[PDB]
Amino acid sequence: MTISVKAELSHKYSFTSPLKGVFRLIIVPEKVSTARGFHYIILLDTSGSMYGVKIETAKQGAMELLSRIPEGNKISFLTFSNNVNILSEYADAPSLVQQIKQIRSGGQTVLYRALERAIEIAKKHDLPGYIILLTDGQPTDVPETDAYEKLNYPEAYKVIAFGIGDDYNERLLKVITDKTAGILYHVEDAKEIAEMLPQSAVTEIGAKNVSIDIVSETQVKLLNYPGPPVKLGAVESVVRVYGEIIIPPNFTGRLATVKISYEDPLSSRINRLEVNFDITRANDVKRFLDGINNDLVNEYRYYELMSKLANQLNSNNLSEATRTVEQMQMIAQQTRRMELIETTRRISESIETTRRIGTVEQTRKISKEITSEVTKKLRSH
């Protein structure tokens, strides 16, 4: 029913140089209530390559997903592949079961036109929501990733993409999710679809229609969310928003103010939260460096490097990928956090083995795996 905010800046004092301050906003949902008033838009690829276990498992998972969504929500279902086909628009689930059962495989993949249609449908109404997308191959209408960069996605609509198999374009889906504060799930086995797709249903939330505005006297740059302002349809689990802000030399005063607004999903009340980053000028270097939260600097750098890692594997720069994961290891071990240390081992782990195999087959695989993991680490649990 509510949201709590802890906001931390890396620097307490400024000094003689332009400084790259980094900040973290931790948003915690409290006493979570049933999620209602959301518009789920499902985009299912039914191309020829989908024939078999992939599409039957997707159909069953879709029905289970519809079962899991609470009742006060609207559902749209699209099937795209040779042409876009709307099964239902802004409706309820009972309509779809019979139609889901008649889905057939066949045709190319027209992801661009399906996304355009999903955007139009989302923009037909004033509800936040989600775009649940499953595909197993590249788009055949628009394979250029830059085109998916330029789309005007609906605000407060998070894209949950399920990339199936070894033939889709992980970089394109990453662009989609990055532009929509979304999540990319790599699915290597169709089995995974049956347990994973229903989890994209949001049952209980701490806030609805969240708006994070950042009023700064200097340039502000978010790491893992579009904005500022950040427009999140809902808060289901802890949100960590990372960003950078240029602290000018010898600055003193109110550097930035973060205003968070949201709707109580139960009381339907507008709550507004306000945090101030007040900085002073340091008159000594030891006095300036003691004002640095080095753990936050290391955490921000860690996630920066992880984003770079996804990009580098997408670019086949395995050498830089190795150097990057190594730095992530050093950061994890410097923070003495078991969770980060293992996560980084598991990744270095894979990168070294791919360098062993030294084939596009394997590089392209771990690219998918790690590209998904980046989005998951940066925008959930």
């Binding site: 140089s17 400084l19 790259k20 602290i247 460096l289 640095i292 080095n294």
Partner: peptide, 27 residues
């Protein structure tokens, strides 16, 4: 040698980074 040192802190900062990672000072 092809790295750069930060003056405010004492970190050896790669020419890859324009800002110091330990302290945030500009190149």
């Amino acid at each position: 040698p092809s790295t750069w040192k930060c003056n405010l802190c004492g970190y050896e900062n790669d020419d890859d980074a324009l800002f110091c990672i330990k302290c945030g000072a500009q190149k």
